[PDB]
Short mmCIF file of C-alpha atoms and ligand atoms in Angstrom, two decimals:
data_model
loop_
_atom_site.label_atom_id
_atom_site.label_comp_id
_atom_site.label_asym_id
_atom_site.label_seq_id
_atom_site.Cartn_x
_atom_site.Cartn_y
_atom_site.Cartn_z
CA UNK A 1 49.72 108.76 191.46
CA UNK A 2 50.24 111.73 189.09
CA UNK A 3 50.87 110.69 185.47
CA UNK A 4 49.82 111.51 181.87
CA UNK A 5 46.88 110.12 180.04
CA UNK A 6 48.37 110.13 176.60
CA UNK A 7 47.02 107.60 174.02
CA UNK A 8 48.91 106.15 172.39
CA UNK A 9 51.33 105.57 175.28
CA UNK A 10 54.63 107.32 174.52
CA UNK A 11 57.83 105.14 173.96
CA UNK A 12 59.55 106.95 176.94
CA UNK A 13 58.06 109.04 179.75
CA UNK A 14 60.22 110.52 182.59
CA UNK A 15 58.08 112.28 185.11
CA UNK A 16 59.44 115.08 187.26
CA UNK A 17 58.56 116.01 190.86
CA UNK A 18 56.63 119.28 190.33
CA UNK A 19 53.46 120.56 188.94
CA UNK A 20 52.81 122.70 185.76
CA UNK A 21 49.64 124.80 185.42
CA UNK A 22 50.50 126.18 182.02
CA UNK A 23 51.35 124.38 178.68
CA UNK A 24 52.11 127.61 176.71
CA UNK A 25 54.62 126.59 173.90
CA UNK A 26 57.93 128.36 174.81
CA UNK A 27 60.14 126.66 172.30
CA UNK A 28 59.62 124.78 168.97
CA UNK A 29 62.76 123.51 167.26
CA UNK A 30 63.63 121.03 164.55
CA UNK A 31 66.69 119.10 165.60
CA UNK A 32 68.82 116.49 163.64
CA UNK A 33 69.27 114.47 166.93
CA UNK A 34 65.65 113.09 166.58
CA UNK A 35 64.35 110.98 163.76
CA UNK A 36 62.07 112.65 161.37
CA UNK A 37 59.11 110.91 163.07
CA UNK A 38 60.19 111.42 166.60
CA UNK A 39 59.75 114.19 169.21
CA UNK A 40 60.72 115.41 172.64
CA UNK A 41 58.13 117.28 174.75
CA UNK A 42 59.38 118.86 177.93
CA UNK A 43 56.80 120.02 180.41
CA UNK A 44 58.03 122.59 182.97
CA UNK A 45 56.25 124.90 185.37
CA UNK A 46 56.83 127.78 182.80
CA UNK A 47 55.47 125.85 179.81
CA UNK A 48 56.30 123.32 177.12
CA UNK A 49 59.37 122.77 175.03
CA UNK A 50 58.91 120.94 171.84
CA UNK A 51 61.75 119.43 169.72
CA UNK A 52 61.11 117.19 166.62
CA UNK A 53 63.33 115.59 164.03
CA UNK A 54 60.98 116.63 161.16
CA UNK A 55 57.53 117.78 160.09
CA UNK A 56 55.92 114.31 160.94
CA UNK A 57 57.47 114.12 164.37
CA UNK A 58 56.38 117.71 164.97
CA UNK A 59 52.73 116.89 164.12
CA UNK A 60 52.91 113.97 166.54
CA UNK A 61 54.34 116.23 169.23
CA UNK A 62 51.52 118.62 168.64
CA UNK A 63 49.01 115.82 169.06
CA UNK A 64 50.56 114.90 172.35
CA UNK A 65 50.56 118.56 173.37
CA UNK A 66 46.77 118.69 172.58
CA UNK A 67 46.17 115.63 174.83
CA UNK A 68 48.19 117.23 177.52
CA UNK A 69 46.19 120.54 177.28
CA UNK A 70 42.92 118.50 177.41
CA UNK A 71 44.14 116.82 180.62
CA UNK A 72 45.19 120.24 182.05
CA UNK A 73 41.77 121.64 181.40
CA UNK A 74 40.40 119.01 183.74
CA UNK A 75 43.07 119.31 186.49
CA UNK A 76 43.04 122.97 187.69
CA UNK A 77 45.71 121.89 190.21
CA UNK A 78 48.05 121.17 187.27
CA UNK A 79 49.82 118.16 185.44
CA UNK A 80 53.16 116.63 186.29
CA UNK A 81 56.31 118.13 184.68
CA UNK A 82 58.72 115.87 182.76
CA UNK A 83 60.24 114.71 179.47
CA UNK A 84 58.40 112.73 176.73
CA UNK A 85 60.66 111.08 174.12
CA UNK A 86 58.50 109.47 171.52
CA UNK A 87 58.52 107.66 168.23
CA UNK A 88 56.20 105.08 166.65
CA UNK A 89 56.70 101.33 166.79
CA UNK A 90 55.26 100.85 163.32
CA UNK A 91 55.20 103.36 160.38
CA UNK A 92 51.74 102.26 159.13
CA UNK A 93 48.90 103.01 161.42
CA UNK A 94 45.64 103.05 159.42
CA UNK A 95 41.83 103.17 159.58
CA UNK A 96 39.58 102.23 156.69
CA UNK A 97 36.34 103.89 155.94
CA UNK A 98 33.82 102.31 153.53
CA UNK A 99 31.88 104.96 151.49
CA UNK A 100 31.10 102.33 148.95
CA UNK A 101 28.53 100.71 151.34
CA UNK A 102 27.38 103.99 152.79
CA UNK A 103 28.51 107.39 151.41
CA UNK A 104 30.30 109.67 153.85
CA UNK A 105 29.83 113.39 153.24
CA UNK A 106 33.08 115.40 153.14
CA UNK A 107 32.44 117.18 156.44
CA UNK A 108 31.93 113.92 158.28
CA UNK A 109 35.18 112.76 156.70
CA UNK A 110 36.88 115.88 158.13
CA UNK A 111 35.59 115.04 161.67
CA UNK A 112 36.72 111.47 161.22
CA UNK A 113 40.16 112.56 160.15
CA UNK A 114 40.50 114.99 163.07
CA UNK A 115 39.56 112.27 165.58
CA UNK A 116 41.97 109.63 164.01
CA UNK A 117 44.78 112.26 163.91
CA UNK A 118 44.24 113.00 167.64
CA UNK A 119 45.43 109.39 168.15
CA UNK A 120 48.40 109.68 165.73
CA UNK A 121 46.93 107.48 162.93
CA UNK A 122 48.63 108.26 159.71
CA UNK A 123 46.80 106.15 157.08
CA UNK A 124 43.25 106.64 155.79
CA UNK A 125 41.95 103.86 153.54
CA UNK A 126 38.97 104.67 151.33
CA UNK A 127 37.03 101.60 150.20
CA UNK A 128 35.55 103.50 147.32
CA UNK A 129 33.89 100.77 145.21
CA UNK A 130 31.99 97.50 145.85
CA UNK A 131 28.69 95.74 144.87
CA UNK A 132 26.55 98.39 146.73
CA UNK A 133 28.14 101.50 145.13
CA UNK A 134 30.79 103.38 143.25
CA UNK A 135 32.08 106.59 144.78
CA UNK A 136 35.10 107.55 142.59
CA UNK A 137 34.40 110.08 139.59
CA UNK A 138 36.09 109.09 136.35
CA UNK A 139 35.98 111.49 133.42
CA UNK A 140 34.62 109.84 130.36
CA UNK A 141 32.46 107.43 132.28
CA UNK A 142 29.37 109.46 133.45
CA UNK A 143 27.13 106.44 134.15
CA UNK A 144 29.26 105.67 137.19
CA UNK A 145 27.64 108.93 138.54
CA UNK A 146 24.09 108.28 137.02
CA UNK A 147 23.79 104.54 137.80
CA UNK A 148 26.63 103.11 139.80
CA UNK A 149 26.45 105.68 142.67
CA UNK A 150 22.74 105.35 143.32
CA UNK A 151 20.86 102.38 144.65
CA UNK A 152 17.16 101.88 145.42
CA UNK A 153 17.34 100.84 149.08
CA UNK A 154 19.43 98.91 151.64
CA UNK A 155 18.39 95.60 152.95
CA UNK A 156 14.70 96.27 152.01
CA UNK A 157 14.34 99.44 153.78
CA UNK A 158 12.80 101.18 150.76
CA UNK A 159 15.05 104.25 151.21
CA UNK A 160 17.32 105.20 148.32
CA UNK A 161 20.93 105.71 149.02
CA UNK A 162 23.39 107.54 146.78
CA UNK A 163 26.47 109.71 146.63
CA UNK A 164 29.71 110.17 144.72
CA UNK A 165 32.72 112.42 145.66
CA UNK A 166 33.97 115.05 143.30
CA UNK A 167 37.51 115.25 142.10
CA UNK A 168 37.68 118.60 144.17
CA UNK A 169 36.34 117.02 147.22
CA UNK A 170 38.94 114.25 147.01
CA UNK A 171 41.82 116.71 146.47
CA UNK A 172 40.42 118.71 149.49
CA UNK A 173 40.46 115.52 151.52
CA UNK A 174 43.91 114.76 150.47
CA UNK A 175 45.23 118.22 151.41
CA UNK A 176 43.40 118.06 154.76
CA UNK A 177 44.85 114.70 155.67
CA UNK A 178 48.32 115.84 154.62
CA UNK A 179 48.10 118.87 156.86
CA UNK A 180 47.12 116.42 159.61
CA UNK A 181 49.96 114.00 158.76
CA UNK A 182 47.66 111.26 157.05
CA UNK A 183 48.21 109.64 153.68
CA UNK A 184 45.11 108.58 151.75
CA UNK A 185 44.92 105.13 150.12
CA UNK A 186 42.15 104.49 147.63
CA UNK A 187 40.78 101.00 146.96
CA UNK A 188 39.39 99.98 143.59
CA UNK A 189 38.17 96.45 143.74
CA UNK A 190 38.81 94.22 140.73
CA UNK A 191 37.91 92.13 138.90
CA UNK A 192 35.04 91.37 141.26
CA UNK A 193 32.95 93.38 143.78
CA UNK A 194 31.68 95.05 140.59
CA UNK A 195 27.85 94.75 140.66
CA UNK A 196 27.57 98.50 140.62
CA UNK A 197 30.06 98.78 137.76
CA UNK A 198 27.93 96.13 135.99
CA UNK A 199 24.75 98.13 136.50
CA UNK A 200 26.62 101.09 134.94
CA UNK A 201 28.57 99.44 132.12
CA UNK A 202 27.34 95.96 131.41
CA UNK A 203 29.50 95.69 128.20
CA UNK A 204 32.62 95.44 130.44
CA UNK A 205 31.57 92.00 131.47
CA UNK A 206 31.56 88.55 129.98
CA UNK A 207 27.73 88.14 130.22
CA UNK A 208 26.26 91.82 129.88
CA UNK A 209 22.99 92.12 131.72
CA UNK A 210 21.34 95.38 131.01
CA UNK A 211 18.70 94.78 133.81
CA UNK A 212 21.44 94.54 136.41
CA UNK A 213 20.89 96.83 139.34
CA UNK A 214 23.23 98.18 142.02
CA UNK A 215 23.26 95.74 144.91
CA UNK A 216 21.21 96.55 147.97
CA UNK A 217 22.07 93.47 150.21
CA UNK A 218 25.34 91.88 151.33
CA UNK A 219 26.88 88.83 149.78
CA UNK A 220 29.15 87.92 146.80
CA UNK A 221 28.63 88.75 143.19
CA UNK A 222 29.95 86.41 140.41
CA UNK A 223 30.22 89.32 137.91
CA UNK A 224 33.75 89.84 136.89
CA UNK A 225 34.99 92.27 134.20
CA UNK A 226 36.09 90.42 131.04
CA UNK A 227 39.85 90.87 130.65
CA UNK A 228 39.55 90.31 126.93
CA UNK A 229 37.62 93.50 126.19
CA UNK A 230 39.83 96.59 125.39
CA UNK A 231 37.28 98.94 126.91
CA UNK A 232 37.87 97.35 130.30
CA UNK A 233 41.57 98.20 130.15
CA UNK A 234 40.90 101.64 128.74
CA UNK A 235 38.56 102.20 131.72
CA UNK A 236 41.09 101.01 134.23
CA UNK A 237 43.83 103.19 132.62
CA UNK A 238 41.44 106.08 133.17
CA UNK A 239 40.73 105.07 136.74
CA UNK A 240 44.44 104.80 137.55
CA UNK A 241 45.30 108.11 135.98
CA UNK A 242 42.50 109.82 138.04
CA UNK A 243 44.03 108.10 141.12
CA UNK A 244 47.53 109.34 140.17
CA UNK A 245 46.18 112.87 139.73
CA UNK A 246 44.18 112.84 143.04
CA UNK A 247 46.21 110.76 145.50
CA UNK A 248 49.91 111.47 145.70
CA UNK A 249 50.64 108.41 147.85
CA UNK A 250 50.69 106.40 144.59
CA UNK A 251 49.39 103.40 146.42
CA UNK A 252 46.34 101.63 144.91
CA UNK A 253 44.53 98.84 146.87
CA UNK A 254 43.11 96.45 144.30
CA UNK A 255 41.24 94.24 146.75
CA UNK A 256 42.41 90.93 145.52
CA UNK A 257 40.28 88.58 147.68
CA UNK A 258 39.42 85.30 145.98
CA UNK A 259 36.80 85.85 143.30
CA UNK A 260 34.34 83.24 141.91
CA UNK A 261 35.51 82.62 138.35
CA UNK A 262 32.48 80.66 137.08
CA UNK A 263 31.62 83.34 134.54
CA UNK A 264 35.23 83.52 133.25
CA UNK A 265 35.02 79.70 132.78
CA UNK A 266 31.88 80.08 130.79
CA UNK A 267 32.92 83.18 128.73
CA UNK A 268 33.79 82.30 125.15
CA UNK A 269 36.28 85.14 124.83
CA UNK A 270 38.04 84.08 128.03
CA UNK A 271 37.80 80.44 127.01
CA UNK A 272 39.62 81.06 123.77
CA UNK A 273 42.03 83.33 125.45
CA UNK A 274 42.97 80.66 127.98
CA UNK A 275 43.35 78.17 125.18
CA UNK A 276 45.47 80.61 123.08
CA UNK A 277 47.84 81.44 126.06
CA UNK A 278 47.91 77.66 127.33
CA UNK A 279 46.23 78.57 130.56
CA UNK A 280 45.20 75.60 132.58
CA UNK A 281 42.34 77.09 134.49
CA UNK A 282 40.89 80.49 135.66
CA UNK A 283 43.53 80.87 138.49
CA UNK A 284 46.24 81.32 135.80
CA UNK A 285 43.80 83.77 134.03
CA UNK A 286 43.52 85.63 137.46
CA UNK A 287 47.41 85.68 137.72
CA UNK A 288 47.62 87.16 134.27
CA UNK A 289 44.94 89.74 134.92
CA UNK A 290 46.78 90.95 138.11
CA UNK A 291 50.14 91.02 136.28
CA UNK A 292 48.58 93.15 133.59
CA UNK A 293 47.07 95.54 136.19
CA UNK A 294 50.44 95.66 138.13
CA UNK A 295 52.28 96.49 134.84
CA UNK A 296 49.80 99.36 134.27
CA UNK A 297 50.19 100.65 137.79
CA UNK A 298 53.92 100.52 137.59
CA UNK A 299 53.91 102.42 134.19
CA UNK A 300 51.96 105.01 136.14
CA UNK A 301 54.42 105.08 138.96
CA UNK A 302 51.88 103.50 141.32
CA UNK A 303 52.19 100.44 143.60
CA UNK A 304 49.44 97.75 144.34
CA UNK A 305 48.14 96.50 147.71
CA UNK A 306 46.15 93.28 148.28
CA UNK A 307 43.91 91.63 150.70
CA UNK A 308 46.25 88.62 151.33
CA UNK A 309 45.35 85.19 149.79
CA UNK A 310 47.81 82.46 150.84
CA UNK A 311 47.77 80.39 147.67
CA UNK A 312 47.01 83.10 145.14
CA UNK A 313 50.34 83.40 143.42
CA UNK A 314 49.57 86.92 142.05
CA UNK A 315 52.18 88.67 144.31
CA UNK A 316 55.72 89.97 143.58
CA UNK A 317 58.43 90.48 146.20
CA UNK A 318 58.20 93.91 147.81
CA UNK A 319 54.42 94.26 147.32
CA UNK A 320 52.14 94.78 150.41
CA UNK A 321 49.36 92.58 151.56
CA UNK A 322 46.99 92.76 154.48
CA UNK A 323 46.31 89.96 156.88
CA UNK A 324 42.64 89.80 157.55
CA UNK A 325 41.09 86.34 157.95
CA UNK A 326 40.29 85.06 161.43
CA UNK A 327 43.25 83.11 162.95
CA UNK A 328 45.57 83.43 159.95
CA UNK A 329 47.72 86.21 161.34
CA UNK A 330 50.84 84.28 162.42
CA UNK A 331 50.69 82.04 159.30
CA UNK A 332 50.41 85.16 157.21
CA UNK A 333 53.35 86.69 158.95
CA UNK A 334 55.53 83.68 158.27
CA UNK A 335 54.27 83.15 154.69
CA UNK A 336 54.99 86.80 153.76
CA UNK A 337 58.47 86.63 155.27
CA UNK A 338 59.11 83.52 153.22
CA UNK A 339 57.71 85.10 150.10
CA UNK A 340 59.47 88.48 150.60
CA UNK A 341 56.19 90.38 150.98
CA UNK A 342 55.44 93.17 153.31
CA UNK A 343 52.41 92.69 155.70
CA UNK A 344 49.87 95.01 157.31
CA UNK A 345 47.98 93.58 160.25
CA UNK A 346 44.25 93.97 159.76
CA UNK A 347 43.09 90.57 161.24
CA UNK A 348 39.27 90.49 161.71
CA UNK A 349 39.77 88.87 165.10
CA UNK A 350 41.10 92.12 166.44
CA UNK A 351 40.75 94.87 163.80
CA UNK A 352 37.33 94.65 162.22
CA UNK A 353 35.46 97.60 163.83
CA UNK A 354 32.10 96.78 162.17
CA UNK A 355 31.55 94.06 164.67
CA UNK A 356 29.69 94.84 167.88
CA UNK A 357 31.89 95.95 170.81
CA UNK A 358 29.56 94.64 173.47
CA UNK A 359 27.89 91.30 173.56
CA UNK A 360 24.08 91.63 172.73
CA UNK A 361 24.62 94.63 170.39
CA UNK A 362 23.31 94.25 166.73
CA UNK A 363 25.27 91.47 165.05
CA UNK A 364 22.96 91.08 162.00
CA UNK A 365 23.06 87.22 162.35
CA UNK A 366 26.77 86.60 161.77
CA UNK A 367 28.96 89.12 163.52
CA UNK A 368 31.13 88.01 166.44
CA UNK A 369 31.78 90.26 169.28
CA UNK A 370 35.04 92.20 169.55
CA UNK A 371 35.36 93.94 172.86
CA UNK A 372 37.72 96.69 173.80
CA UNK A 373 39.93 94.52 175.84
CA UNK A 374 39.98 91.87 173.13
CA UNK A 375 41.08 94.59 170.77
CA UNK A 376 43.85 95.78 173.06
CA UNK A 377 45.16 92.20 173.26
CA UNK A 378 46.49 92.85 169.74
CA UNK A 379 50.29 92.53 169.23
CA UNK A 380 50.89 93.12 165.51
CA UNK A 381 54.04 90.96 165.50
CA UNK A 382 52.30 88.23 167.68
CA UNK A 383 55.22 87.79 169.92
CA UNK A 384 57.96 88.07 167.36
CA UNK A 385 60.71 90.68 167.76
CA UNK A 386 61.35 93.41 165.07
CA UNK A 387 64.51 91.68 164.00
CA UNK A 388 62.48 88.60 163.14
CA UNK A 389 59.19 90.32 161.80
CA UNK A 390 60.69 93.41 160.32
CA UNK A 391 58.52 93.07 157.23
CA UNK A 392 55.38 94.01 159.21
CA UNK A 393 54.62 97.66 158.34
CA UNK A 394 51.99 98.19 160.96
CA UNK A 395 48.32 97.87 161.81
CA UNK A 396 45.02 98.74 159.99
CA UNK A 397 41.48 98.68 161.24
CA UNK A 398 38.63 98.48 158.70
CA UNK A 399 35.26 99.93 159.61
CA UNK A 400 33.01 98.10 157.11
CA UNK A 401 29.79 100.02 156.60
CA UNK A 402 27.10 97.59 155.43
CA UNK A 403 25.24 98.49 158.70
CA UNK A 404 26.73 101.96 159.41
CA UNK A 405 24.56 104.42 157.62
CA UNK A 406 25.86 107.73 159.03
CA UNK A 407 28.80 109.21 160.99
CA UNK A 408 27.03 108.62 164.25
CA UNK A 409 26.87 104.96 163.91
CA UNK A 410 30.37 104.92 162.24
CA UNK A 411 31.97 106.63 165.23
CA UNK A 412 30.02 104.58 167.77
CA UNK A 413 31.46 101.40 166.28
CA UNK A 414 34.92 102.80 165.50
CA UNK A 415 35.59 104.26 168.94
CA UNK A 416 36.99 103.56 171.43
CA UNK A 417 38.51 100.40 169.86
CA UNK A 418 40.38 102.61 167.38
CA UNK A 419 42.22 104.01 170.35
CA UNK A 420 43.42 100.53 171.19
CA UNK A 421 44.46 99.98 167.50
CA UNK A 422 46.40 103.32 167.73
CA UNK A 423 48.14 102.15 170.86
CA UNK A 424 49.03 98.76 169.19
CA UNK A 425 50.39 100.54 166.25
CA UNK A 426 52.42 103.13 168.09
CA UNK A 427 53.45 101.97 171.52
CA UNK A 428 56.20 99.41 172.16
CA UNK A 429 55.02 96.39 174.30
CA UNK A 430 57.20 97.55 177.15
CA UNK A 431 54.86 100.45 177.89
CA UNK A 432 51.58 98.69 177.02
CA UNK A 433 49.18 97.31 179.60
CA UNK A 434 45.39 96.93 179.88
CA UNK A 435 45.14 98.67 183.14
CA UNK A 436 47.00 101.81 182.11
CA UNK A 437 45.16 101.94 178.88
CA UNK A 438 41.79 101.54 180.64
CA UNK A 439 42.60 104.43 183.01
CA UNK A 440 43.77 106.64 180.12
CA UNK A 441 40.58 105.81 178.20
CA UNK A 442 38.43 106.83 181.22
CA UNK A 443 40.12 110.26 181.13
CA UNK A 444 39.75 110.35 177.28
CA UNK A 445 36.03 110.21 177.57
CA UNK A 446 36.22 113.77 178.91
CA UNK A 447 39.05 114.58 176.56
CA UNK A 448 36.96 113.79 173.50
CA UNK A 449 33.80 115.38 174.93
CA UNK A 450 35.72 118.66 175.32
CA UNK A 451 37.72 118.66 172.04
CA UNK A 452 35.43 117.11 169.57
CA UNK A 453 32.01 117.33 171.25
CA UNK A 454 31.52 113.63 170.76
CA UNK A 455 30.44 111.06 173.43
CA UNK A 456 32.58 107.92 173.72
CA UNK A 457 30.62 106.25 176.45
CA UNK A 458 29.84 102.65 175.57
CA UNK A 459 26.96 100.70 177.22
CA UNK A 460 25.12 97.62 176.05
CA UNK A 461 22.05 99.73 175.19
CA UNK A 462 23.21 103.17 174.17
CA UNK A 463 24.16 102.27 170.63
CA UNK A 464 22.13 104.58 168.15
CA UNK A 465 18.99 102.97 166.79
CA UNK A 466 18.93 101.24 163.43
CA UNK A 467 16.04 101.16 160.83
CA UNK A 468 16.65 97.49 159.82
CA UNK A 469 15.49 94.08 161.30
C1 NAG B 501 38.08 91.33 151.18
C2 NAG B 501 36.77 90.93 151.80
O1 NAG B 501 36.18 89.87 151.65
N1 NAG B 501 36.34 91.89 152.78
C3 NAG B 501 35.17 91.78 153.43
C4 NAG B 501 34.11 92.95 153.28
O2 NAG B 501 33.72 93.00 151.88
C5 NAG B 501 32.93 92.84 154.24
O3 NAG B 501 32.25 94.06 154.16
C6 NAG B 501 33.49 92.65 155.67
C7 NAG B 501 32.29 92.50 156.70
O4 NAG B 501 32.80 92.31 157.92
O5 NAG B 501 34.26 91.44 155.71
C8 NAG B 501 35.44 91.57 155.04
O6 NAG B 501 36.17 90.43 155.14
ZN1 ZN B 502 35.26 87.01 129.56
#
């Protein structure tokens, strides 16, 4: 029967037995009887009444009101009256874009931000640096622009790809997201994922190779910055100061996935440094490296985030890690609870949106299929109650862009599974069901077509064409 098609599903909906043909905002109050992230929207035959506990809840309420107006535009007979009392299950609901692999122009970022805000996402994670490119401008290091932001091709396509954001563009993005209720989280991978950095500044590395080029294929790089060189730390101080000036969130994602340490083992500087500090192997050196980086961030008033590694030992209680490996989600939950860490659920089994969403679509020889229903199966706590898994801050979906060269491909792979991620991050389990979500997404096809002029229809053969083989 008559109901709302709001994604994510509100925490409480009470429908009433008459129809409203107008959603004109008649009242808009800030009330202390709601949490700062909660709202109450009342639909009456005369219009809508919005109450919110704060600016964040008001932004969420306006998103819900937009979805209601999009529904009303398609139902000339009107939508049901009622009362929506809403607040999120988790305070962290994030998407990650990967401009390092493929640069994303500022206007495409604005469109992406608008779409994710329509679904009450509040975290935007920028994977700014990797082997295939460096997108963060740092004063005093212009080769990052002239070398590390340009690559000759991508997987042998013979087409150069390049791009780097300006400080002004990044501050514009920050203000844009803030106006839409989204905090921006930069990621600067270290000490690895630095082939582009090595192409730009080989003297930062244990074995400088002047012929090093920015990587044009996937895979791992053995090139780690040398922790013994003072210019490395001067450079990272400069990077962190730029991040402090640009991104007010004060959160810096350092990557932190297990790096191959063969070159550290061979490095004469690092060899004598390990001997001098009585370090047994290169994992103690990695611990010392991350301790130094964390001290630097803390002196700047910044806080680190990591891709979780169970037996890394580089973490301090209170810090935040991401669960990402296939089938390690519950183990990561329990390990972080033991170690006093906070956890963000980004498990590749449910949250990696670079994987094909329909079986048979391009998998590039390794990607498994993550359907929309599979995605919606995601419970970030994995059956545990909030009183038992209170250290879980929320959900995070990465859209890795090795094979996503423009916004069209990016949005094709990101949606509509990002809607499922949003509902998993926002809606309590009591109001979640695959049937309701499927109905609502069927309506949201037209909602998105009307509001963003974007086509969310997904068939096996309607994915935009690629240039690779
Ligand atoms: C920390 C880490 O290893 N992240 C990788 C990322 O570099 C890669 O682009 C993606 C491909 O799906 O897989 C992730 O696991
Ligand atoms: Zn070294």
